[PDB]
């Protein structure tokens, strides 16, 4: 089975929030990397890719997975590099279903967005 798993990626102009909202600005050259544990409960599955200009990434993956998600590397905006993590203590990743046991048919899986977070406040945050 083949799957591409795809996604976006922003920066968030707004350091007092952590959200994406109408003053997000889509990141091209962001790196993101997919890891899935395959119920083994370490990694065991990992793939690496870039966003282009749209802030877009779109990994290849080869096999069904489970336990996989994705989650933010390096930022290509030095003002712009935070990963915010959440309120529970912990980082955000975004999960993907690549399981063999549904009815879904499609080959790209969507994924829920992330950000990096500048330092700043923007007007209007
Ligand atoms: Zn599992």
Redo the contacts with the bound molecule.
Sequence with gaps: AKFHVEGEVYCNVCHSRNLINELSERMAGAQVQLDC?D?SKKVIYSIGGETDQDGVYRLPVVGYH??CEIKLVKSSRPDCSEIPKLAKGTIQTSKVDLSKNTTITEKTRHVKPLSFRAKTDAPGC
Excluded: G, L, Y
Aim: aromatic share 0%.
């Design positions: 544990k119920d489970e336990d």
